[PDB]
Structure formats: structure tokens, C-alpha cells
A paper describes a structure:
One of the mutants, [name], revealed an enhanced activity (by twofold) compared to wild type and was thus chosen for cryo-EM structure determination. A total of 227,000 particles were used in the final refinement (C2 symmetry), with a global resolution of 3.3 Å and a local resolution at 3.2 Å. The [name] mutation appears to have increased conformational flexibility of Glu494. However, the overall structure of [name]-BRIL is largely similar to that of the wild type, with some additional density between the dimer interface assigned as detergent molecules, which were used in solubilization [dodecyl maltoside (DDM)]. Density, which appeared to be phospholipid-like, was also seen near the dimer interface, with one phosphatidylethanolamine molecule providing an anchor between TMHII of one molecule and surrounding helices of the other molecule through Phe598 and Phe680. As a result of the improved resolution of the structure of the [name] mutant, several new features could be resolved; most notably, a number of water molecules lining the polar channel from the cytoplasmic side to the binuclear site could be seen. A closer examination of a residue near the proposed proton entry site (Arg255) reveals a water molecule between Glu572 and Arg255, which may act as a proton entry point. A water molecule was found ligating the carboxyl group of Glu490 and Glu559 (the higher-resolution AxqNOR-[name] structure provides clear density of Glu559), which is not the case in GsqNOR, as this water does not ligate to the equivalent residues Glu512 and Glu581. The significantly enhanced activity of [name] is likely to arise from alleviating proton transfer as the rate-limiting step. This most likely results from increased conformational dynamics of Glu494, which shuttles the proton toward the catalytic pocket.
Residue numbers in the entry:
A (entry chain A), B (entry chain B): 1 to 743
The structure:
Amino acid sequence: MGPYRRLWFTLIAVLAVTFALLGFYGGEVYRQAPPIPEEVASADGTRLFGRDDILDGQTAWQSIGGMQLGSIWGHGAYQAPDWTADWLHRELMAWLDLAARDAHGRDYGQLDAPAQAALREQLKAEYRANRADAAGGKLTLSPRRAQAVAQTEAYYDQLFSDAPALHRSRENYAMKENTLPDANRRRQMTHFFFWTAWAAGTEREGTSVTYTNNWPHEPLIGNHPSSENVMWSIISVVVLLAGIGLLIWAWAFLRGKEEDEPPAPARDPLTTFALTPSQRALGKYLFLVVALFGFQVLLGGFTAHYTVEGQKFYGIDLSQWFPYSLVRTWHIQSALFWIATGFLAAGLFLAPLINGGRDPKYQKAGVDILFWALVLVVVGSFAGNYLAIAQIMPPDLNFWLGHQGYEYVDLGRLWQIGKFAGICFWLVLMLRGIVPALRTPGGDKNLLALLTASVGAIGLFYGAGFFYGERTHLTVMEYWRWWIVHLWVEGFFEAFATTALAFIFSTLGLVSRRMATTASLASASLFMLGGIPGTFHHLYFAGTTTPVMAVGASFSALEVVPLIVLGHEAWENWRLKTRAPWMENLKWPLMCFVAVAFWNMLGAGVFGFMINPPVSLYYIQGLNTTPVHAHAALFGVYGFLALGFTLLVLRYIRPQYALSPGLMKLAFWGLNLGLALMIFTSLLPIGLIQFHASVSEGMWYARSEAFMQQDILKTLRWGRTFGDVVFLLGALAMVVQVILGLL
Amino acid sequence: MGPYRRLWFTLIAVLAVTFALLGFYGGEVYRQAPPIPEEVASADGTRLFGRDDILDGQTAWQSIGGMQLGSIWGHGAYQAPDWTADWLHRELMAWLDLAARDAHGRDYGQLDAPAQAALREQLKAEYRANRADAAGGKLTLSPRRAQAVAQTEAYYDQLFSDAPALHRSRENYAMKENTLPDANRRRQMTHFFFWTAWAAGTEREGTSVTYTNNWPHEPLIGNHPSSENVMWSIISVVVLLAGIGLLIWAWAFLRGKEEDEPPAPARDPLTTFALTPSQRALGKYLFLVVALFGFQVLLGGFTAHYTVEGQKFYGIDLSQWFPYSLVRTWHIQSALFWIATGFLAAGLFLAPLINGGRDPKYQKAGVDILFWALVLVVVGSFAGNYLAIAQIMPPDLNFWLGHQGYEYVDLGRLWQIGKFAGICFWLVLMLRGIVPALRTPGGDKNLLALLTASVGAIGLFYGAGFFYGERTHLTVMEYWRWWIVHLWVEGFFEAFATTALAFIFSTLGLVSRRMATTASLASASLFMLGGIPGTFHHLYFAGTTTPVMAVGASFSALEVVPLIVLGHEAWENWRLKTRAPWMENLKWPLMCFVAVAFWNMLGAGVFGFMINPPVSLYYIQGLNTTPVHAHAALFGVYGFLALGFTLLVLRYIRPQYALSPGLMKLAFWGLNLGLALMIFTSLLPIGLIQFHASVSEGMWYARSEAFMQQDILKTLRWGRTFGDVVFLLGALAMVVQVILGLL
Ligand code: HEM
Ligand code: HEM
Ligand code: HEM
Ligand code: HEM
Ligand SMILES: [Ca+2]
Ligand SMILES: [Ca+2]
Ligand SMILES: [Fe+3]
Ligand SMILES: [Fe+3]
């Protein structure tokens, strides 16, 4: 439509190509998944567990916290070990002991190296084979492997059962003391752990890669990164460099240098409109954003104390009421809640201002219903997490209200349905402001159609957090989980907070509908080419095949290439301040939108491609260079956009309040300096020492308590505090600034 | 000096820091070199070879062609196998056979896998130990290893001695039939090969890395990329991305947008000066450049026929007179000669024009003496290579006049002394034109001091091609060799062909001494920060330690970072064409300087960092992704700069000759399209298949004749021709254009 027939058709073609690339390979993720075996049995014929016990153990694992206690297939928390690697290493060492007993009379560690090599070559014939019975439903594992599985079952039966022998192992893993009051639930959760470490051990039918693409790096069964893994890794590095260079070449040559130089108006154009009640009802939203932000930084500082200290916290223990999984669940979920609530507040700010300057019918009541629905969803979700991790809750009603166990979707399915209904109600309150400004027979729907499609994308695509039930397959709950963590949080918050920012900078008269639409459709098609099928860089090592990794390496090297080139759209945007005299009221939001760009190249670009290619992520998935990228990209991009929109909507609803520079200097350069201080001095060197240990000895070694208490990694995570107090001072100054602004 | 006290002191500090980094680590490359053992002996006490026989075999290996027949420690040609990996694999398989004989009565391939693992764990106790006797001079290797060495000695005694059993192995390796008419020289060259495959096999004193940093990827002795290898590789990738992004951030913000917009003069300022004899004597130089260029493309097409076909060439064989090593020696050396001669011609063009418009005293005679000295050096070097590879030369006088054996320095030491004396005579003829324009008491020495330092650097730094004699240590001949291939060819042709280009574009009045000096000292200090201590990415896997690799990964990620950002200085140096109406006479040089930039990001940036980091180069050093980078970076950067400086000096010595567009379109878009066609369709897919085979089975497997005749790699190098005829038509059109211009 309009004079944008090239850019709009490019955007639609990119959307269709990348969504066909998601659908055709999601069918494969669905059909090339590792089979949950119907009846596991020993070779003699005794009846071991089945797929019903494996899925009941999966539900029991979801009850204890799930991916907030430790990792499964690399995806989880990072204090407790990854259970599919720790179970694998303990089962392999039990098999090596039971193979050295009836062959040499000793253990594995007492034998000489030509005997240990002959035993490991016996390991790589039983574990890298003996898969399912080809739709026969049986497994039929060896009696030595049966005794090894039943021998390592006792370790996790004593680990989650308050045994005093495995005390000082639960303090190094930050687990609470009891952690499972039932005895059948542990006995089934070890069956679930065996299934996750059996899918990670046995090859496929016809290939030399396992079901998790050779993942948990184990030299005992010979788990090394495969051939096409390294091929697509070096192809992705070539694609990254020839993407950055060809993008700079095509920008410098194929550009239209018009230099129209549009003049800025002499008055702030959003102050000519009136203070309607739907604008004034956003003080509760801007209070909830910084309240959840202060709560989130406090819970982040509280879940970092279980890493340094044990489970005591300077006296009597509160780990029986607030364990590490609960405060980490809250520290993740309230982060997602305030980041979504800041963008919802910015949308509800822009929604009456699109439709002239007036509200639609029944708008303030809808804004109030939406605010109290969001507060009810937060409070009910946190009460459900507390009731599910403390096990004061029935396991029949654990998934619906309680804890889902998977990170970034930890809130229960009833509260997830409530959050999706609140997001659809915000979609209704957005379209009721946009559609009466598009139903008029005019020619004003140039950028507003892109904003309408972006609002529909951020509103409707939380429904992909369904299509996985309570006891369904784990690979399907790691394909539809990243549809709403990579495609919606990363992909459709960027596509909303850039086009709404372009609409704001266009309505102020600073950009003039040609750098607000051609530079906002090209900046929404460079990202949907590498962001929509880049979802597969989370599905490398979880039940998928080699072409999923092939798509997710190449089409995620192509989303770093418009992020490294962010000198433009960081100086372009920065200049806008030096274009009008009334822009000094918007100095501090326009500074955050500069820092948004900086942590969009350092957080998502440099540290996003450090862990991206499939031979680098192999030794990294589950280590401490993932919270580097997570803290630098979720707070540095979407946690400064939501604090830029908060201070922009603090203006034009409290227009007589100056932002008081001297406090906002602390609130900006405490957050930025603390984020750069707690990442570059504590998280990244720990992650690099873990990376050296994970490439040296194995994935089990980087997560084990013999390595995470190495007395150099004790002081290096004790050194979180010298960046953490700085981050807490910056976040506290931002909170006090917004509260003093709201009254 | 002048108003450039910041940039000049930055350049001097970068020079001093990177040259201290070269000196302090070159001392370590001198002292941490692998020892040539004084007396190799078996365990019983029989006297095997010594270091004198090893160095005489090194001289014998230099006599046959050296690094133009096959590789040693990764550095060499790519048709014949790498001899330190092929000797290593044959010695290991001979040891495995002689260890399976007296233990099971069978061979290695007939045993089951728990016996083969127990034999390989016996391999990694004798080969990864038993180094030198700690300044005792002895080696004292096992009698099983002695029989393995004497058993694999017969294979290379039959390989280089026209044996009919190893015929069709010499046609797959492109070696000529006889290749060594002596019998003691082969018997010592196998001792040299044993030393190169013994240094690459045994660990150091105290560490788990071998003397060549674990290099030839062999799962038998467990040669894998080490821990700090992978650590400094991922640190180099982070340094690359945070160099590109921070460079774009510091360019977009810390820039002075003055927009002075200097006007171009109405007449071409290099035509106001007169045609002196020192300008008119450059027709011989511009004839020699394109004569050696046509000869070089013909010899490249002739050394690519020994890869596809055997040693016959469509009838009776000329491999006895022109083998693969001789035509490859010529194809490399005449490439270096015409690339240096084009820059010498551009310097001799600029040298009288700096000193007003007049020649100094005795200038045309000096130009004629220099031209005939260069022609004598080319003819004497090629006759020496022909007499040394055919063995119609005494071995006492082989290194001085003959073949040095090391690639890019293949011409003999007498001819190398003659080439260095010609380069110093060109230094004299340059300074005789520059210094009388600097001895005047004025204020014109702004850019000319940088040009003087650059001309002194390109003149004096060929003397680092000395400091290695005839029989000196191979690691020292791989540290002082790359002082004049990486630091002088790559580092001081770029620092000469950019500052002379800035001087030319400043003399025309197109840039105005502020984009010709601030953009030429910043473009000469971004490159000397990653170019001067980046020399160590050629010294990873040749006798060096881990900190040499640590310097060469980090300080060579920092030389890709000003090469990927080449949209600027490719559009800045093309905008000019539209600046003046008389610029249409310089359309085709200014188009070549555009393509210079393009292959400076695709040839040196994308394909230069594809093979750069020490875990990627480990599986690549010696494969067919090195001629990708070599053909794209030596011709695409320094072979289009020397053809831009040829067609620029074709003007202003033949000013009445229009460059005839229609033929120059063929000469440009045949060279560019053939270089992009013979790289992306034949060399890079062969290199990627070899990379997959080198990460799968080993370094011996990627080079062996069982893999290079795999019938998919036969047609894929047979498909060189469909880009080769296009490159030949482009080079032929350039040759005919310059010859028709010169008369
Ligand atoms: C002083 C401030 C903070 C501290 C001390 C802190 C600390 C932590 C800790 C200890 C973890 C768990 C690491 C593990 O699993 O072992 C974590 C995870 C996480 N934090 Fe924070 N945090 C802080 C601020 C923030 C902020 C502002 C955000 C903004 C969105 C955030 C988002 C996250 C996320 C997404 C994770 C999950 C990472 C993952 O699971 O891989 N954090 N943080
Ligand atoms: C722009 C905003 C971005 C945000 C907010 C973001 C957020 C996150 C978070 C929170 C995680 C942690 C997942 C977990 O805890 O299991 C993650 C993982 C990951 N991110 Fe990003 N990301 C962003 C951009 C990128 C980009 C551009 C890349 C490009 C390659 C990338 C590469 C990765 C990879 C490979 C992982 C997998 C690590 C793992 O699963 O352990 N990210 N991302
Ligand atoms: C039709 C044109 C050409 C053809 C067919 C060709 C072919 C070849 C061949 C077959 C090799 C040997 C590969 C091996 O060692 O196995 C080679 C090496 C080389 N060629 Fe060319 N070439 C051509 C043009 C050029 C040009 C114009 C240059 C400009 C400087 C050049 C520079 C080199 C260099 C430096 C090497 C050595 C690479 C190394 O040793 O790693 N070639 N070329
Ligand atoms: C700009 C002009 C450049 C030229 C003319 C050039 C030339 C060459 C040549 C001819 C070789 C072959 C060496 C041999 O035959 O043994 C080589 C090797 C290599 N180049 Fe470059 N290069 C350039 C830039 C770069 C850059 C910027 C990098 C940055 C990382 C780089 C990385 C490498 C590496 C790692 C090797 C080692 C491959 C091996 O030794 O087998 N090159 N270069
Ligand atoms: Ca995580
Ligand atoms: Ca070479
Ligand atoms: Fe992602
Ligand atoms: Fe180099």
C-alpha cells in the first residue's frame, strides 16, 4: 500500500518464507523426536518402569521447580547440576565399576589405562546402541545397565529426600532440605531422569548421532560434536561476516541521499492533546512497573545469595519457605511481568492519542480491569509457585495452578490462560484506539498498519504457549516454549518497541514519515529474517535432527548482522535530542534508547553469537555464559526499553515534574555500570573457566560440586556483590525517581 | 608534527607496542623451539641418524621443491600429502601392526575394538612421551618404533625413486617420475620427515601439548585441539565482534561532521606537469607487469592441470622438465614479482612528481638499471628453480642459487640478495625524489612524512628474509619467513598503496589534506595494530607455545575489524568519480580501487577469519580453504591495486589514449567474475569437504589419495575450468588493453 510496494512485499515474503521454515521443520521436530519407550525391561524379563511412570516422573519433576532447580538437556538453572548429564556420568561410572568387578576384581579408577580403554570401548557398544524396538514398545537393556540404573537411582533417592549423608551437597546445589515429601514421586523422577539421559546417550537408526544430537559432552561413550555440527558452525561464521560486510556495502552504496532536513516544530506536539482519564489511569501501571522492578532486583540479589552462601542466610534458614527454585522462579517471572507491563503501559498511552486525542467508549474502565487483572495474575502466579514448590498442593492440580516447571513459563496454566486473556484484552483496548483511526476514508494508514500488525503479533502469539499439556513429550515442550520466549519476547517486543518508538518520534515531528516508515519496515524485515527461524538455536540439543541445527545456525547468524551495525540508529536517534529545544524534557528516555542500542550489540550481538554456533553452544549450553547473555539482553534491551517508555509516559501524565538530573544520573549510570560490572567481572570469567572445564573433561565436570567450589569460583561469584550493590543503587534510584514523579 | 599530535603519537605507540610484542615473543619462538636431537638411537644401542643427517635431509628436501611439492607442518602445497602427517599416520599404523603381531598374531584392522582401544592406549604412552634427553643429546626410542620408522622409510624411499609400484600414486600427488636421482638424499629426507613428525607427536616437558601445539589431527595418539587453543579461539571471536561493533559505535559518535565540501579544480593537475624521461621510462615497467601477469595466469592454469590430469598433459609428458613443483614455484614467484613491480612502477611515477615536476640528477639511468636488474632477478631466479628441481645442480650450491624450498621465498639466496638490493635501489630512487621536497624549509611535510616512513618500511623490511641460513632450524625459518610474507606483503603493501593513493587523490584536489591525512593515519594505525603482531597466526602449529597462539588470535581478530567495515572508503573513494568532469579518464582505475575494497572484505575479512581462530585453523591448515583466501586476497587486494596503479600510470604517460570501454569491461568483469567463480564453485566446496573429512577421521585423511580421488572431488576440481577460462579472458583482455595502450 502507498509508495511502499517494495518494502511491504519484502516484509510479507520474509514472513511467509521464515514461517514456512518454522512449520515444515516443526513437523520434523514432532516426528523425529526420541521415543518414550512403552515398557522398559531388563534382558532377563523383569518388568521395569514404562512410559506412564516416566511421564508421572516428568510431572513430579515439574512439581519440585522443574527447570529452576537444575537443567534438563541444558535448559535450566545453573547451580544444581544438569540432571541428564549427572545421571549419565553416574550411570556410566556405575557400569564401569560393574564391568571392572567381573573382569579384573577392582574398580575403574584402580585399573591401568589399556584396561580402561578396553572398558570404554565396551561402553561405546551398549550405550550408543540398544534403542527402542522399532515401534515394538520395548527397550530390553542389559542386566549390568539395569544394576547401574538401580545403583544410581539410590543417589537421587537420597538427594531429594533429606538424607544427612548428602547434606553439604544440597547446600552446594542450593536445594532445600526435604525437596520431595513423597517417596513414589522421587522413584518416578529418577525414571524421568533416566529417560532424559537415555535419549542423550543412544544413537539414532542409521546415523552416528544420538537423539539429542550427541549433546552431553562425555568422552566415556564418545559424545563429541558431530561432523555437520562443525560444518554448519563454520558456515554460520562465514554467513555472519559476509552478512555484516555485505550489509555495510549495500547500505553505503544502495542508499537514497535526499537530505530533506525536516524542521522541528516549536512546541511539543503531545502536550497539545488533553489529559484524558485513559492517560491518567496509567499511574498505576507506572507504579506496578517499578514496584515489580524493585522486587525483581531484590529477588535477583536473593537468589544470588544461595549461590555464594548455602541455605541459611545469616542465621536461621528460610530455605524451607523460600528455596532457590522459588526465588529464581520469582526473579524470572516478575522480570517478564514488568517488561511486558511497561510495553502494555506504552501501548495504552499511545492508543487514545492515535484516535485523535480522545478515548473510545468504556476505556478507563477497561484499563482499570486490565490493571487489576494483571495484579491478580501476578499474585495468583506467585502464590501458586509458593504452594507448588513447598508441596502444600495436590499433584493432580499442580500444572494448572502451581508450577509448570519450565523456565519463562513457570506460572501455572490457569494463570497463563489469565495472562493470555489479559493480553487479548489489551489487544482489544489497542484496536479500539487504532481501528477508528483506520476506518476513516483517508490516506493516513502508512505506518499505522505496521503498528497494527505488530500489536496483533505481540497480542496473539502468546497462544503458542499452549499446544503442550501436562504430560506431553519434552521435545514438544521445548519447541512451543521458545515460540513465546524467542519469537515473542525477543522477536515481537523488538517489533513493537521500535515501531511505537518510530510513531512517537514521527508525531513529535523529528522524523517525517520517510525515515519513520522506510527505516521501520527495513528495521522490521532485517530482524524477521533471522529472528523467526532462529528459534531453532534453542532446539539444537533437545530431541531434534541435524537440519534443525542447520536452519538455526545460518538463520541466527543473520540476526546478529543488523545488531552489530548499531552506530547508526544510536546516533541517528541521539541526534533527535539536538533538534528541538523542548527535547530536554525527554533527555533521559532518549539516553536509555541509546543504551538500548549499546546492549543490543554487546548483549545480543557479541555475547549472543559467542554462544550461538553449534560447536560453541555444545560446550556452553547450561553454563555461566548463558546468564551473561540473558542479563545483558533481557535487561539491557527490553529492560531499558521498558524503563525508557516508563520515563516517557512519566512525562505527559505528570508534565510539571522535572526528572531531577543528579538522581537520574545515578539511576542510569548505576544500572549500566552494574550490568557491565557484574557480567564482566563475575559471570563471564566463571563461564569461561566452566567452558575450559567442559571442553577439557566433560559437561558433567563443569556443573559438579567438585568444580563449582574450587575456591577460585567461590570468590569469583562472591565478587558479584561489587557490581550488585551498584546495580541495586541504580535500580533503587530509578524506583525512587518514578515514585517521586507519580506524586 | 603539525596539528596531528594525537594521530602521529597513536601510530608511534601502536608501532612500538606491536613491535615489542613481536620481539619478546620471537625470543620465545627462538628458545621454546623443538630440539633437533643430536643422536637418535634405538633402545638396544645401535646408532641411527643424528641432527647432521636430519639437517642434510632438510637441505635435500629443499632441493626437490620444498614446500611446493607437499606440506610440512601445514605450510606448503596441497596436492601431495602433508609429509609430517602422512609419515605420522604411516608410522603409527606400522607401530600398531608390530604391536598386534606379538600380542594377537593379526594385524590392526583384523582385531576387535576393545583390543584396538587397548593398543591405542599403548600408543599414547610411547609417542606422547620419549622426547629428548634434557640436553643429553639422545632420543633413545623403542625397537618397535625403530622397526616402524625403518618400515615407513621404505615407502618414501620408493616414492621419490621412480618405482613402478608407487606409480599412479605419483600421478595423484602430481610429483614427477624420478624426483630424486640420488639414494642418500632420499635416505636423509626420510630422517627429516621423521623429525618433522616426531616434533609433531611428542609432548613438552610438563604439559600435555606437543611441540607443534598438538597439531596434526590424529585420534591414534590423541592429537586434538588443546584447552587454551579453544579458549583463545572463542576469545578471538568475541574480540572480533566487539571490535566491529565498538568501531562502528566510535565512528558514528566520535566524528567531526564539518562538511567543508572542497571544490574540485577544472583541470587534471597531473597533466600540467611535463613528461620527463623518468616518467616515460615506465613503459617497460608497465609492460613487464602485464607480461608477468599473463605468464602468471598461464602458469596458474598449467599448475591446475596437474591436479585434474596426471603428469602427461594430453600426450607425451613434460613433467620431467616442468613438474608441478616448478610451475607452482613460478606461479607463486612471478605473482609476487608483478605485484611488487606494479607498486615499484607507481612509486617511480610519484617520485619526480613529488619534487615539483622535475627529475633529480641521474634518474632515468637509475630507472633503467633498476628495470634490467628486476628482469635479471626474474630470469635468474626462474633458471635457478629449473636447475634445482630437475637436479642438474650441485647440492652445495643449491640454496644460494637454485631453490630455497620455502614458499613465497622460493628464489635462491643470491637472487634474493639481488632482489633486496633492487628494492634498496628503488628506496634510493624514491628518497632522491622525496627528500629534496622535504629538505626545503617549509610546512608541506604533513602527509609526505607518512609516505616517507611507508616507503622506508616497504624498502627495508625485506631484510627480515635473511636471519635464516641453509641448515638452520625450521621454526626459525617459519618465524622470519612470515616477517616478509605477512608483515611486508600484507602489511607494507597496504600501508604503501593507501598512502600513495591518498597522495594521488590529494594532488588531484579531490580530498583536501584533512581527509588525506586524518583518514590516512587512522587507516594506517587500525591496520598496524592487528597486522604487526598478527604474524603469529602463521606460527600457531609450527614449534611455538600457547602464548604465541594467544597473541596471534587476539591481535589478528583486530585486523578483520577495519576490513569488514568497508562500505566507507569504497563509496568515499567512488563518490569522487562524480566530483570532477575530467575524472572519466580515471573511471577504470577508480573502479578497480572499488573492487580492491570488495575483495578486502570478502577475501581478507570473511575468508580470512574463517581460517583464523586456532580451533578452526587446526582442522584447516593445509587444506583447500587456504588457496581460497590466498587467491581472493593476493589477487583481489594486491593484484587489483597493482592493476589500478598500472592503468593509472597508463594515463599521464600515454595521455592521448582512451582506455576503450568494451574491452576494459571484459578485463574487469572477467577477472572479478572468474575470481568469484573459481573460488565459490570449486575451491571452497573442496575445502569444506576436506574440512569435514579432517574433523571426522584426521588430517592424514583429508590429504591422502584415497580421498582426493573420491570421484566427487575429481569433478569438483575439474570444474575449475568454467571459472578459469573466464579469468583467462579477463586477464587476457587486461594484457591486450595495456599493450595497445603502450604503443
Ligand atoms: C542486582 C541484580 C541481579 C542479580 C544479582 C541477579 C542474579 C541472578 C541469578 C543468581 C540468576 C540465576 C543464575 C542461575 O540460574 O544459576 C539470575 C537469572 C536470571 N536473571 Fe537475574 N539478577 C539481577 C537482575 C536481573 C534483571 C534486572 C533482569 C531483567 C530482566 C534479570 C533477568 C534474569 C533472567 C532472565 C535470568 C535467567 C537466566 C537463565 O535462566 O539462563 N536479572 N539472575
Ligand atoms: C535481543 C534480545 C535477546 C534477548 C532478550 C535474549 C534472551 C535470551 C535468554 C533470556 C536466554 C536464556 C535461555 C535460557 O535461560 O534457557 C537466551 C538464550 C540464547 N540466546 Fe538470546 N536473546 C536475545 C538475542 C539473541 C540473539 C540476537 C542471538 C543471536 C545468535 C541469541 C542467541 C542465544 C542462544 C544461542 C541462546 C541459547 C543458550 C542456551 O539455551 O543455553 N540471543 N536468550
Ligand atoms: C586462471 C588463474 C589461476 C589459476 C588456475 C590458479 C591456480 C592455482 C593452483 C592450482 C594453485 C596451487 C594449489 C595447490 O597448492 O594445490 C595456486 C596457488 C596459488 N596461486 Fe594461483 N591460480 C590462478 C591465478 C592466480 C593469481 C592471479 C594470483 C595472484 C597473486 C595467484 C596466486 C596464487 C598463490 C599465492 C598461490 C599459493 C597459495 C598457497 O600456497 O596456499 N593465483 N593457484
Ligand atoms: C589483505 C591481504 C591478505 C593477503 C594478501 C593474504 C595472503 C595470504 C596468503 C597468500 C596465505 C597463504 C599462506 C601459505 O600459502 O602458506 C595466507 C594465509 C593466512 N591468512 Fe592471509 N592474507 C591477507 C589478509 C589476511 C587477514 C586480514 C587475515 C585475518 C585473520 C588472514 C588470515 C590468514 C591465516 C590464518 C592464514 C593461515 C593459513 C595457513 O597458513 O594455511 N589473512 N594469507
Ligand atoms: Ca536458563
Ligand atoms: Ca600455501
Ligand atoms: Fe533465541
Ligand atoms: Fe597472515
